[PDB]
Write a protein that binds this ligand. Structure first.
Ligand code: ADP
Ligand code: ADP
Ligand code: HG
Ligand code: HG
Ligand code: HG
Ligand code: HG
Ligand code: HG
Ligand code: HG
Ligand code: HG
Ligand code: HG
Ligand code: HG
Ligand code: HG
Ligand code: HG
Ligand code: HG
Ligand code: HG
Ligand code: HG
Ligand code: HG
Ligand code: HG
Ligand code: MG
Ligand code: MG
Lengths: 579, 579
């Protein structure tokens, strides 16, 4: 009642009158209370931060297993929080609100189940939102009363207090078994697993939802079939297990190779049970590797792939403002290695192919003396045998990886086939360099000298760091705005505590054995250890970092790997590195 | 005086009081008058549209050649307007304004000289801007008086009335000789020309300015050297002329191949005289061709490259919501052909390489029966001999195009070399399908049925069409926001006059012999003829189209080819096509 009474008594008064709200709590329903955290300056501006809280109506026993929240599996807690968020949003599609304003901004999840600051299960369910308070320049009492009483209150009462305890419990189970399966891949002796009956294709070019119509379910070649009995559902699933080493994915155009590789890329994530890619997992450290022309690089050793540059330019400590296709990809590989990646994913179409192979005709035209590039084909075995680093590759034009392949697959009309033997036969009927101990200090002094601040995430595509744009359009395993919001935050903290935080983070990271994953479960350099500290700390700090440089509201952050954090900083154009 | 007096007498009064401005003209200086066109609703909103006018202080005789503006060469008029705009902006860097607010928004040009609605030479110089009128919710009289009196007035008086008549005249000459050279390429028997002494490289990965330091000037191989005496400067320049047919650009990594191809891509444009790429020209219809995964296609015949798709899917009238690498590239090629392109530019790194070639080992694994893709290598000669369509290609991995090549170039440390003979030798020491008469009606009925409007350009990267995002991030010859603003406008007009405009445009386009180029100088289907009408009309209408669906201010539009207009519509996901 009170809040409505309030919005009544201010119905016409001046907008600044709203400031009285700040920090206050209002029962707008029996089950729904509403704290204001912040109040907007004008109606035009970014809305007031709000926190809404309602209670567990489901049983911590059935759903979380443990009696009290602290003792619960963080993976189930995260999956639950991901369910509640989805329910909330679905509530709009089912027209639950008596009135729909569009003044509410709550983070929208992806197909993936991530830890986010948006929905919290506390010791009691809290949701963080921005509400654009209605108001010509005086308060709209009734505009606002609708938002809270006839949009939010019912929404929460219904799709949240009123959530389906059974639906939730099955959501948590599916998410948990996915995590089980991925975190058992290594032990079981695999590098990837594609579950039979999976629906790999998406519904459109700009969709991440499964194909509705005529999707051809994935079926494992009989020779690669694996089984895993999931602990929580108790169900036993079969699929294709890929062993350590080099896997080739071959086949004609439009036969699904890239569609399969994509599912693999995002196999470091758990999905919504009906995503179609559930139980399609890969090594948690898997990195999509691609050419990235024109990107900048600082202090990366790519001499395993590139030597003898024009004018004797160092590849041992490579530094450009304008990468080519081959040196950007080699830089990506070497940065992936430093950040901990044990599995490389490649797709011929986005590869700098001159990096990949060179036929004999070409070597005649352009002899190795004229050619800085050492092909990947001559290094892939080095990486795998000496360093435990596997590769999966979609290939078209060339078959000269057949010899190195441990698995060669052929795709015909979306069907997978094991053609390893035939591959090897064709190979006969025809015709360490890496060092785990990388040398790199991030140089905060050099990197930050031009900073005039503001650090903000821009969609999924970039970070605005002062007068600098960090381009993430080709860091392709970034999946949610919240992740970018996450990256933009250590950056701001990395900068705001400029002197003490870098040595702190770098020391922190050297110590660690386990890094937190995006689903919440918990080769070296100064740089990577720092990065490993960048977000060990951010995860302890529960994903949000209040610093003078950060202007992000509460509840718009999503977990990301340390690999992606390092990904962003590697691509900062002011970046300076040292020894 | 008056306007200041005005902004004084309203200094504290309510913001709505500003509406009195609208449509009024104010002499804020002897040489500078200022019409308001529009006034913002609130201070927060997008600013008031303003038009400022000052006079020719330079001589139409020396600069434009003709006595009166109407009779002047549109290319010189456009170049002049491009100079004045640049001068205006430079005025900020040289701190000309006594006060710099940041409330002024004028379109910023690129390195390229384009026709724009921003600066107009009329029969008298007019500039179109948005000014964010300062104002808590009441007018800022002094905030505003600064903007006009101490920022704009001096700016225009100084870098515009006070422009360097000699600098301008040399700008116009350079631009005109560039246009002369490109529009004489065909006649002279070439397809591209790279002027000796050109500075191809850019200064950074995210810059379009020439490299400052240690740039290695382009030098033509002696065997390809051409000369052209420019009519207006009277200067004679030399460089590399590329003949019709297939040119290969080969060479090691980091040797400048992509840097050269890029200069070629944008060689359909005129640049600022000190750009470094001036007199680096190609066929005006040149199109960069690349893979574009996941894009949508409707009604394109790609059967020259793709046949036998899974489940008997038509390639004769190809239609997906999710293109693969090979079918999107083939679709790009076929769309380019339909839109009139006589010159194809390709770069191995962004190619779907399985489209490009397949080695023998691969054909053993995956026989043609399993392979929908017919390689480009088997079609390039068809295109060139039968249809006059040339190709220039950066290639790395494979040398199987050597046989078809008419010119093979090798790049070593940024030096170009003619290795055609040696290429051919290696080729020996080893080992029509297109139909000009394309069948396609745009179907306005099918395409527009989901439109709930608003059409707006988003940077250089996309168009927002109702609840649809047209993705242009890989239409790579788009160079200015204004071009996107241009495309977004026929779309809105195409839609707003839904019934009568499509048959009108399509008829208009069938009639035409000459299409206007971005610098202002003036294979078939229903679709392309429509497109050729889309912007014959937009150019007559002087680039701006007032329709209920368009909310773009005056003076933020830039010319684009019809090819790019068609480029955008081909990529609309609701697009429906017919016969
Ligand atoms: N298993 C599948 N079932 C149904 N459709 C699929 C399947 N895999 C891919 N597709 C669809 O067919 C198209 C071709 O797939 P893609 O993997 O891109 O081919 P390529 O082998 O060239 O990578 C895609 O646009 C996708 O939407
Ligand atoms: N003529 C030149 N003079 C000086 N630097 C150049 C020149 N051409 C290219 N570069 C620089 O060297 C790098 C390699 O050029 P690029 O064309 O990308 O190599 P690639 O042959 O692999 O395409 C680019 O980042 C560019 O900035
Ligand atoms: Hg709640
Ligand atoms: Hg877990
Ligand atoms: Hg499941
Ligand atoms: Hg398995
Ligand atoms: Hg590859
Ligand atoms: Hg086989
Ligand atoms: Hg983290
Ligand atoms: Hg923050
Ligand atoms: Hg002027
Ligand atoms: Hg001209
Ligand atoms: Hg010039
Ligand atoms: Hg020439
Ligand atoms: Hg190519
Ligand atoms: Hg040569
Ligand atoms: Hg046009
Ligand atoms: Hg308009
Ligand atoms: Mg492929
Ligand atoms: Mg290249």
């Amino acid at each position: 009642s009170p809040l409505m009474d309030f919005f009544h008594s201010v119905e016409g008064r001046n907008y600044g009158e709203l400031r009285s709200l700040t920090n206050e709590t209002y029962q707008i329903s029996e089950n729904v209370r509403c704290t204001f955290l912040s109040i907007q300056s004008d109606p035009f501006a970014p809305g007031s931060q709000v926190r809404l809280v309602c209670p567990c109506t489901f049983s911590l026993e059935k759903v979380l297993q443990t009696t009290d929240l602290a003792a619960a599996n963080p993976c189930r807690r995260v999956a639950a929080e991901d369910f509640i968020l989805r329910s909330f949003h679905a509530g709009y599609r089912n027209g639950i609100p008596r009135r729909t304003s569009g003044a509410v901004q709550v983070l929208r999840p992806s197909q993936h189940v991530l830890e986010r600051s948006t929905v919290g299960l506390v010791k009691e369910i809290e949701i963080f939102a921005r509400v654009k308070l209605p108001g010509g320049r005086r308060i709209d009492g009734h505009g606002a009363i609708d938002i809270f009483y006839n949009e939010l209150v019912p929404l929460l009462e219904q799709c949240v207090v009123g959530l389906n305890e059974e639906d939730l419990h099955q959501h948590v189970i599916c998410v948990h078994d996915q995590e089980e399966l991925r975190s058992n891949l290594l032990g079981a002796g695999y590098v990837a697993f594609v579950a039979n009956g999976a629906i790999l294709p998406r519904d459109a070019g700009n969709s991440d939802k499964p194909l509705r119509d005529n999707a051809v379910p994935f079926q494992s070649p009989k020779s690669l079939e694996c089984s895993f009995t999931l602990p929580h559902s108790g169900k036993t699933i079969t699929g294709m297990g890929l062993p350590p080493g080099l896997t080739l994915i071959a086949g004609g155009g439009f036969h699904g190779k890239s569609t399969l590789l994509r599912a693999l890329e995002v196999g470091i994530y758990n999905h919504v049970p009906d995503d179609g890619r559930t139980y399609v997992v890969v090594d948690p450290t898997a990195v999509k590797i691609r050419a990235e022309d024109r990107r900048s690089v600082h202090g990366v050793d790519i001499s395993p792939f590139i030597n003898n540059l024009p004018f004797g330019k160092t590849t041992n400590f490579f530094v450009t403002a304008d990468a080519s296709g081959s040196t950007s990809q080699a830089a990506n590989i070497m940065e992936a290695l430093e950040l901990g990646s044990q599995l490389l994913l490649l797709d011929e179409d986005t590869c700098a192919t001159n990096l990949m192979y060179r036929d004999a005709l070409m070597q005649m035209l352009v002899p190795r003396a004229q050619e800085p590039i050492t092909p990947f084909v001559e290094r892939v075995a080095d990486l795998s045998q000496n360093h435990g680093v596997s590769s999966i590759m979609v290939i078209g034009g060339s078959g000269q990886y057949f010899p190195q392949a441990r698995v060669v697959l052929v795709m015909n009309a979306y069907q997978i086939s094991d053609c390893t033997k035939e591959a090897k036969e064709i190979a006969s009927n025809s015709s360490s360099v890496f060092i785990p101990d990388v040398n790199r200090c991030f140089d905060p002094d050099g990197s930050f000298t031009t900073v005039r601040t503001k650090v903000s995430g821009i969609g999924t595509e970039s970070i605005r760091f002062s007068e600098e744009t960090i381009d993430l359009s080709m860091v392709e395993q970034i999946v949610e705005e919240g992740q970018v919001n996450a990256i933009a935050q250590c950056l701001a903290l990395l900068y705001d505590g400029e002197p003490r935080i870098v040595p702190e983070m770098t020391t922190k990271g050297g110590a660690l054995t386990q890094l937190p994953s995006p689903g919440g479960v918990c080769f070296n350099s100064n740089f990577s250890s720092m990065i490993a500290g960048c977000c060990s700390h951010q995860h302890d700090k529960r994903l949000e970092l209040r610093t003078p440089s950060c202007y992000l509201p509460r509840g718009f952050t999503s977990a990301t790997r340390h690999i992606e954090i390092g990904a962003a900083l590697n691509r900062l154009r002011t970046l300076r590195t040292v020894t």
